[PDB]
Amino acid sequence: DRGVNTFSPEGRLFQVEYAIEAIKLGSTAIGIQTSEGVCLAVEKRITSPLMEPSSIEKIVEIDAHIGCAMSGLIADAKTLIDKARVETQNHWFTYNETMTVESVTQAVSNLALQFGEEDADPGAMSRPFGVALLFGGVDEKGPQLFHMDPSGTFVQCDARAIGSASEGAQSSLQEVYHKSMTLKEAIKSSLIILKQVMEEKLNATNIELATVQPGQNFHMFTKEELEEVIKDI
């Protein structure tokens, strides 16, 4: 046993490396950025038919122009999501404008290494967050997808998978992605990939899907709209 802010001989924080390994215990999520908008798709991972599938929420609205998909220790994601929401509302309050996707991601990412046991307040964070996040949205730069992990590193991606089967899924994403791909193609591609990687047979209740487009606000697909897209796939 050693402290939570101990470096390994390779120059990494043990706690952060271990938090990154926790992301691999999460369900798979996929993000794709097209010129017509971004989509976010996630495997629900239902463990009993008695569980209400609509109570699993692994895609959330941050603001009208920004959604977020998560994988890893989901309970950990709540304070990050709430910080994202509060930050975009503060930015609106102060500046009377929408906050960029990049800026939201940056604000959240500055929480990442704020843990430790002898600088801070009486019961501050004891460990990093075991969560990875995909922020998908539209701002004056156009559609945008950003990835963030427990190191506080964030980066724009054209397409990205996270969670258990992300290797796999990332490989299929390289194969199918192209810069001029339509949103409807991106939606189909991500369901085709989820279908391959999921242990369960894909259907309209054990996945979630959302989009954000230049025309249109954050939109969660309904059961009926998922069924339509599932027919071809």
């Binding site: 402290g3 120059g11 924080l13 500055n110 600088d119 724009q156 390289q174």
Partner: protein
């Protein structure tokens, strides 16, 4: 071993293993190069992309009109330190209505980063910086380390395979002071290119450039804007 988990534990050889380990975070970052002439200070950085579909991590950051940085190591530590630098610069303009001299800012970094190396349960900063600036004493390149030491440089490279870049920079450094801007940036790029596997080359996707000088506020060049500098590596 019993000596390597706490920044407060000296080893029997007079070393602090936690500081040495923090320095490995910088040696494993992607390479960056800094150099200067009589009139300009330049930063050149290789950006690592996770997959073929990722953007490439930012390596060069604006601090003030007269100061920019290039980073290697933990990105979150780089942002924390960059925010400290920005704030110190803003304070100096607010109070004195003039730019913070570059050497004074670097001193402030040394003093700030030393503190957690001496207190139980704290850790060093796991980031190394190249700092380009221009003030009344002309252009500067400084380097900062997780040990809280810093160095005033004619030119420098840090990160993975930076030994090759340093060897190029030593070989050509007698030319730098008299270089025009284009010549100086070309030298930065050739140094950085020495860090690459033989197959691979500098492209508009993987190179980022920062420049400041007498007539030029700190400016970052990325993507299509680096093309002028890459063409004519002839």
């Amino acid at each position: 071993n019993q000596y390597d988990n706490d920044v407060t534990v000296w080893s029997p050889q007079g070393r602090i293993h936690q500081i040495e380990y923090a320095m490995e975070a910088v040696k494993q970052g992607s390479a960056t190069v800094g150099l200067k002439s009589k009139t300009h200070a330049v930063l050149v950085a290789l950006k690592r992309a996770q997959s073929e579909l990722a953007a490439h991590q930012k390596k060069i950051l604006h601090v003030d009109n007269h100061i920019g940085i290039s980073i290697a190591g933990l990105t979150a530590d780089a942002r924390l330190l960059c925010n400290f630098m920005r704030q110190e610069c803003l304070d100096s303009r607010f109070v004195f209505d003039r730019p913070l001299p570059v050497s004074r800012l670097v001193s402030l970094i040394g003093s700030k980063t030393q503190i957690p190396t001496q207190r139980y349960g704290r850790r060093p900063y796991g980031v190394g910086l190249l700092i380009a600036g221009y003030d009344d004493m002309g252009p500067h390149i400084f380097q900062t380390c997780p040990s809280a030491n810093y160095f005033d440089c004619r030119a420098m490279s840090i990160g993975a395979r930076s030994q090759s870049a340093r060897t190029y920079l030593e070989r050509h450094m007698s030319e730098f002071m008299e270089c025009n801007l284009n010549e100086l940036v070309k030298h930065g790029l050739r140094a950085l290119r020495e860090t690459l596997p033989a197959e691979q080359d500098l492209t508009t996707k993987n190179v980022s450039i920062g420049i400041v000088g007498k007539d030029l506020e700190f400016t970052i060049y990325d993507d299509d804007d680096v093309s002028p500098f890459l063409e004519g590596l002839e």
